[PDB]
Structure formats: C-alpha cells, structure tokens
From a paper:
The PWWP domain comprises 100–130 amine acids and is often present in chromatin-associated proteins. Our structures revealed that the overall fold of the PWWP domain consists of three motifs: a canonical β-barrel core, an insertion motif between the second and third β-strands and a C-terminal α-helix bundle. The canonical β-barrel core harbors an aromatic cage constructed by three aromatic residues, which is a signature feature of the Tudor domain “Royal family”. Taken together, similar to other members in the ‘Royal family’, PWWP domain also exhibits methyllysine histone binding ability.
DNMT3A and DNMT3B are DNA methyltransferase, which are essential for de novo methylation and mammalian development. The PWWP domains of the DNA methyltransfearses DNMT3A and DNMT3B are essential for targeting DNA methylation to heterochromatin regions through their chromatin binding ability. DNMT3A was recruited to the chromatin region with the H3K36me3 mark through its interaction of the PWWP domain with H3K36me3. DNMT3A had been shown to bind histone H3K36me3, but we were not able to obtain its cocrystals with H3K36me3, Nevertheless, we found a bis-tris buffer molecule in both the DNMT3A and DNMT3B structures. The bis-tris molecule resides in the conserved aromatic cage of the PWWP domains. Superposition of the DNMT3A and DNMT3B with the BRPF1 and HDGF2 complex structures shows that the bis-tris molecule is bound in the position occupied by the tri-methyl ammonium group of the methyllysine. The bis-tris molecule is bound to DNMT3A and DNMT3B in slightly different conformations. In the DNMT3A structure, the bis-tris molecule forms two hydrogen bonds with the D333 residue from DNMT3A, and three hydrogen bonds with residues G298, L300 and S304 through a conserved water molecule. The bis-tris molecule in complex with the PWWP domain of DNMT3A or DNMT3B provides a clue for designing small molecules targeting their histone binding domain.
Numbering used by the authors: 9 to 111, 124 to 151
C-alpha cells in the first residue's frame, strides 16, 4: 500500500487540504481502517483529527505536520472549536513521539503551539515520525 514514490506513508501526521476548508490536521491511515476501499495512485486515506472523518486526499494537497507555520491559520483557530480540538490532538500525538513533555484545550494548546512554531525543538521534525 502507498508504494507509489509519493511519500506520506501510514502513520504520518499531516496537514490536509480539501476544497472549501482550511488546512486541517490528520494522520495517514491504511484503507482497511476506513471501512471503505483502496485509494487511487497519488492519493492517501487521511483520518482527520477533531471528528475522525475519513477522506481520500491527493498528495499535492498534503503537507507534513512540520509545515506547521505555513498551514496553521489563526482566524480558523479563534472561530472553530473543532480546529482547536484537532490542533490539541495532533500535537498531543506529536509530542508523545518526540518525547516532548509539557507541565482546558485552549490553555494546554499554547505551549504545544509554541513548540510547533519554534521548529519542534529539541527533536525537530524527525521526532514527529511514527515509532
């Protein structure tokens, strides 16, 4: 599965872009997790954080989580509680992988967002990879 040389393999935390919606946090899953069928070449199944919906997304509309500064939209964050939830979730998962520890969603998000914005120090983007 996904051996087409386009990257974004299973378990990778990503930003995904559908028409009519902001870049949204998700993770790449296998097709059998979706309760659907195989994705076409050059596309991936992503499970969105926030509500856990599944979508087929072309790799051209995917960015790694590390592209946080380009994808993160402050206006969306302010107005959409599910976006704050999605940010919370993807960064909880990311920080667990990187071994980045932090000392209700809006509160806990701030150090995690700062971490993301600062280049995911000390691990960098490498710490965000599936174990």
């Amino acid at each position: 599965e996904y051996e087409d040389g386009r990257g974004f393999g299973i378990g990778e935390l990503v930003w995904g872009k559908l028409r009519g919606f902001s870049w949204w946090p998700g993770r790449i899953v296998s097709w059998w997790m979706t309760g659907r069928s195989r994705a076409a070449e050059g596309t991936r199944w992503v499970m969105w954080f926030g509500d856990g919906k599944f979508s087929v997304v072309c790799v051209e509309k995917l960015m790694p989580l590390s592209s946080f500064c380009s994808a993160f939209h402050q206006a969306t964050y302010n107005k959409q509680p599910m976006y704050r939830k999605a940010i919370y979730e993807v960064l909880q998962v990311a920080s667990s992988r990187a071994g980045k520890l932090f000392p209700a969603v809006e509160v806990q998000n701030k150090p995690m967002i700062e971490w993301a914005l600062g280049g995911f120090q000390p691990s960098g983007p490498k710490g965000l990879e599936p174990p």
